[PDB]
Structure formats: structure tokens, C-alpha cells
Coordinates of all heavy atoms in Angstrom, one line a residue:
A178 N 163.9 25.8 123.8 CA 163.3 26.1 122.5 C 163.0 27.6 122.5 O 163.3 28.3 121.5 CB 162.1 25.3 122.3
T179 N 162.4 28.0 123.5 CA 162.0 29.4 123.7 C 163.1 30.4 123.7 O 163.1 31.4 123.0 CB 161.1 29.6 124.9 OG1 160.1 28.6 124.9 CG2 160.5 31.0 125.0
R180 N 164.2 30.1 124.5 CA 165.4 30.9 124.5 C 166.0 31.0 123.1 O 166.3 32.1 122.7 CB 166.5 30.3 125.4 CG 167.8 31.0 125.2 CD 169.0 30.1 125.7 NE 168.9 28.8 125.0 CZ 169.5 27.8 125.5 NH1 170.2 27.8 126.7 NH2 169.5 26.6 124.9
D181 N 166.1 29.9 122.4 CA 166.7 29.9 121.1 C 165.9 30.8 120.1 O 166.5 31.6 119.3 CB 166.8 28.5 120.5 CG 167.6 27.6 121.4 OD1 168.5 28.1 122.1 OD2 167.4 26.3 121.3
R182 N 164.6 30.7 120.2 CA 163.8 31.5 119.3 C 164.0 33.1 119.5 O 164.0 33.8 118.6 CB 162.3 31.2 119.5 CG 161.4 31.9 118.6 CD 160.0 31.5 118.8 NE 159.3 32.5 119.6 CZ 158.8 32.3 120.8 NH1 158.9 31.1 121.4 NH2 158.2 33.3 121.5
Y183 N 164.2 33.5 120.8 CA 164.4 34.9 121.0 C 165.8 35.2 120.5 O 166.0 36.3 119.9 CB 164.2 35.3 122.5 CG 162.8 35.4 122.9 CD1 162.1 34.3 123.5 CD2 162.0 36.5 122.5 CE1 160.8 34.4 123.8 CE2 160.7 36.6 122.8 CZ 160.1 35.5 123.5 OH 158.7 35.6 123.8
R184 N 166.7 34.3 120.7 CA 168.1 34.5 120.3 C 168.2 34.7 118.8 O 169.0 35.5 118.3 CB 169.0 33.3 120.7 CG 170.4 33.4 120.3 CD 171.3 32.5 121.2 NE 171.0 31.0 121.1 CZ 171.2 30.1 122.0 NH1 171.7 30.5 123.1 NH2 170.9 28.8 121.7
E185 N 167.3 33.9 118.1 CA 167.3 33.8 116.6 C 167.7 35.0 115.7 O 168.8 35.0 115.1 CB 166.1 33.1 116.1 CG 166.3 32.0 115.1 CD 166.6 30.7 115.7 OE1 167.7 30.6 116.4 OE2 165.9 29.7 115.5
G186 N 166.9 36.1 115.7 CA 165.9 36.4 116.7 C 166.4 37.8 117.0 O 165.9 38.8 116.5
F187 N 167.3 37.9 117.9 CA 168.0 39.2 118.2 C 169.2 39.3 117.2 O 169.6 40.4 116.9 CB 168.4 39.3 119.6 CG 167.3 39.4 120.6 CD1 167.3 38.8 121.8 CD2 166.2 40.2 120.3 CE1 166.2 38.9 122.7 CE2 165.1 40.3 121.1 CZ 165.1 39.6 122.3
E188 N 169.7 38.1 116.8 CA 170.8 38.1 115.9 C 170.3 38.5 114.5 O 171.1 38.7 113.6 CB 171.5 36.7 115.9 CG 172.5 36.5 116.9 CD 172.7 35.1 117.3 OE1 172.1 34.2 116.8 OE2 173.6 34.8 118.2
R189 N 169.0 38.5 114.2 CA 168.5 38.9 112.9 C 168.2 40.4 112.9 O 168.7 41.2 112.1 CB 167.3 38.1 112.5 CG 166.6 38.5 111.2 CD 165.7 37.4 110.6 NE 164.7 36.9 111.5 CZ 164.7 35.7 112.1 NH1 165.6 34.8 111.9 NH2 163.7 35.4 113.0
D190 N 167.3 40.9 113.8 CA 166.9 42.3 113.8 C 167.5 43.1 114.9 O 167.1 44.3 115.1 CB 165.4 42.4 113.7 CG 164.7 41.1 114.0 OD1 164.7 40.2 113.1 OD2 164.0 41.0 115.0
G191 N 168.4 42.5 115.7 CA 169.1 43.3 116.7 C 168.5 43.3 118.1 O 167.3 43.1 118.3
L192 N 169.4 43.5 119.1 CA 169.0 43.7 120.4 C 167.9 44.8 120.6 O 168.0 45.8 119.9 CB 170.2 44.0 121.3 CG 171.2 42.9 121.5 CD1 172.4 43.4 122.3 CD2 170.5 41.7 122.2
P193 N 167.0 44.6 121.5 CA 165.9 45.6 121.8 C 166.6 46.8 122.4 O 167.6 46.7 123.0 CB 165.1 44.9 122.9 CG 165.4 43.4 122.8 CD 166.8 43.4 122.4
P194 N 165.9 48.0 122.3 CA 166.4 49.2 122.9 C 166.6 49.1 124.4 O 165.8 48.3 125.0 CB 165.3 50.3 122.6 CG 164.5 49.7 121.5 CD 164.6 48.2 121.6
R195 N 167.5 49.8 125.0 CA 167.7 49.8 126.4 C 166.4 50.0 127.2 O 166.2 49.5 128.3 CB 168.7 50.8 126.9 CG 170.0 50.1 127.4 CD 170.1 50.2 128.9 NE 170.9 51.4 129.3 CZ 172.2 51.4 129.2 NH1 172.9 50.4 128.7 NH2 172.9 52.5 129.6
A196 N 165.4 50.7 126.6 CA 164.1 51.0 127.3 C 163.4 49.6 127.4 O 162.9 49.4 128.5 CB 163.3 51.9 126.5
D197 N 163.3 48.9 126.4 CA 162.6 47.6 126.4 C 163.2 46.6 127.4 O 162.5 45.9 128.1 CB 162.6 46.9 125.0 CG 162.0 47.9 124.0 OD1 161.7 49.0 124.3 OD2 161.7 47.4 122.8
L198 N 164.5 46.7 127.4 CA 165.3 45.8 128.3 C 165.0 46.2 129.8 O 164.7 45.3 130.6 CB 166.8 46.0 128.0 CG 167.4 44.8 127.2 CD1 166.4 44.2 126.3 CD2 168.6 45.3 126.5
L199 N 165.1 47.4 130.1 CA 164.8 47.9 131.5 C 163.4 47.5 131.8 O 163.2 46.9 132.9 CB 164.9 49.4 131.6 CG 166.4 49.9 131.6 CD1 166.5 51.4 131.8 CD2 167.2 49.1 132.6
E200 N 162.5 47.7 130.9 CA 161.1 47.3 131.1 C 161.0 45.8 131.3 O 160.4 45.3 132.2 CB 160.2 47.7 129.9 CG 158.8 47.3 130.0 CD 158.1 47.8 131.3 OE1 158.6 48.8 131.8 OE2 157.1 47.2 131.7
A201 N 161.8 45.0 130.5 CA 161.8 43.6 130.6 C 162.3 43.2 132.0 O 161.7 42.3 132.7 CB 162.6 42.9 129.6
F202 N 163.3 43.8 132.5 CA 163.9 43.4 133.8 C 163.0 43.7 134.9 O 162.8 43.0 135.9 CB 165.3 44.1 134.0 CG 166.4 43.4 133.4 CD1 167.0 43.9 132.3 CD2 166.9 42.2 133.9 CE1 168.1 43.2 131.7 CE2 168.0 41.5 133.3 CZ 168.6 42.1 132.2
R203 N 162.3 44.9 134.8 CA 161.3 45.3 135.8 C 160.2 44.2 135.8 O 159.9 43.6 136.9 CB 160.7 46.7 135.5 CG 161.6 47.8 135.9 CD 160.9 49.2 135.7 NE 161.7 50.3 136.0 CZ 162.4 51.1 135.1 NH1 162.3 50.8 133.8 NH2 163.1 52.1 135.5
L204 N 159.6 44.0 134.7 CA 158.6 43.0 134.4 C 158.9 41.7 135.1 O 158.0 41.1 135.7 CB 158.5 42.8 132.9 CG 157.1 42.4 132.3 CD1 156.0 42.7 133.3 CD2 157.0 43.2 131.0
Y205 N 160.1 41.2 135.0 CA 160.5 39.9 135.6 C 160.4 39.9 137.1 O 160.1 38.9 137.7 CB 161.9 39.4 135.1 CG 162.2 38.1 135.7 CD1 161.7 36.9 135.2 CD2 163.0 38.0 136.9 CE1 161.9 35.7 135.7 CE2 163.2 36.7 137.4 CZ 162.7 35.6 136.9 OH 163.0 34.4 137.4
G206 N 160.8 41.1 137.7 CA 160.7 41.2 139.2 C 161.7 42.2 139.7 O 161.5 42.7 140.8
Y207 N 162.7 42.6 138.9 CA 163.8 43.5 139.5 C 163.3 44.9 139.8 O 162.5 45.5 139.1 CB 164.9 43.5 138.5 CG 165.7 42.2 138.4 CD1 165.5 41.3 137.4 CD2 166.7 41.9 139.4 CE1 166.1 40.1 137.3 CE2 167.3 40.7 139.3 CZ 167.1 39.8 138.3 OH 167.7 38.6 138.2
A208 N 163.7 45.3 141.0 CA 163.3 46.6 141.6 C 164.3 47.7 141.1 O 165.3 48.0 141.7 CB 163.4 46.6 143.1
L209 N 164.0 48.2 139.9 CA 164.8 49.2 139.2 C 164.6 50.6 139.7 O 163.5 51.0 140.0 CB 164.7 49.1 137.7 CG 165.1 47.8 137.1 CD1 165.1 47.9 135.6 CD2 166.5 47.4 137.6
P210 N 165.7 51.4 139.8 CA 165.6 52.8 140.1 C 164.9 53.6 139.0 O 164.6 53.0 138.0 CB 167.0 53.3 140.2 CG 167.8 52.0 140.5 CD 167.1 50.9 139.8
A211 N 164.6 54.9 139.3 CA 163.8 55.7 138.4 C 164.6 56.0 137.1 O 164.1 56.2 136.0 CB 163.4 57.0 139.0
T212 N 165.9 56.0 137.2 CA 166.9 56.2 136.1 C 168.1 55.3 136.3 O 168.7 55.2 137.4 CB 167.3 57.6 136.1 OG1 167.5 58.1 137.4 CG2 166.2 58.5 135.4
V213 N 168.4 54.5 135.2 CA 169.4 53.5 135.3 C 170.8 53.9 134.8 O 171.1 53.9 133.6 CB 169.0 52.2 134.7 CG1 170.0 51.1 134.9 CG2 167.6 51.7 135.3
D214 N 171.7 54.1 135.7 CA 173.2 54.3 135.5 C 173.8 53.2 134.6 O 173.2 52.1 134.5 CB 173.8 54.1 136.9 CG 175.0 55.0 137.1 OD1 174.9 56.2 136.6 OD2 175.9 54.6 137.7
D215 N 174.9 53.5 134.0 CA 175.6 52.5 133.2 C 176.2 51.5 134.1 O 176.2 50.3 133.8 CB 176.7 53.1 132.4 CG 176.2 53.5 131.0 OD1 175.1 53.2 130.6 OD2 177.1 54.1 130.2
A216 N 176.6 51.9 135.3 CA 177.2 51.1 136.3 C 176.1 50.2 136.9 O 176.3 49.0 137.2 CB 177.9 51.9 137.3

């Protein structure tokens, strides 16, 4: 239910900026470098 709502969601007002995404991934647990390569 929760996944679908976010999906809704992004298909309406668009995917979050890469900044929010990086932040989201860090937040979850991922040990991100200071600057994130495309690779």
C-alpha cells in the first residue's frame, strides 16, 4: 500500500531531485561517498 502511494505519486509530480534520492539512500543505511559519480 505504502509503495503504491509513493509510486502514485512520483508518476504525478515527478521523481525527486538526485539530492533527495542520495539523502534517502543514506538515510536508509547506505554508506555514500562525499560526492556521487554517475557510475
Side-chain angles (χ1 to χ4, degrees):
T179 309
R180 170 201 54 203
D181 301 335
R182 184 179 100 244
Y183 283 100
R184 182 157 65 203
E185 226 82 299
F187 292 140
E188 274 154 1
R189 179 163 53 249
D190 11 290
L192 289 176
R195 250 251 266 285
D197 303 9
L198 257 31
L199 286 189
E200 178 60 21
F202 277 106
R203 283 184 182 100
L204 209 19
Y205 180 81
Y207 290 97
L209 294 189
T212 39
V213 182
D214 218 35
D215 268 356

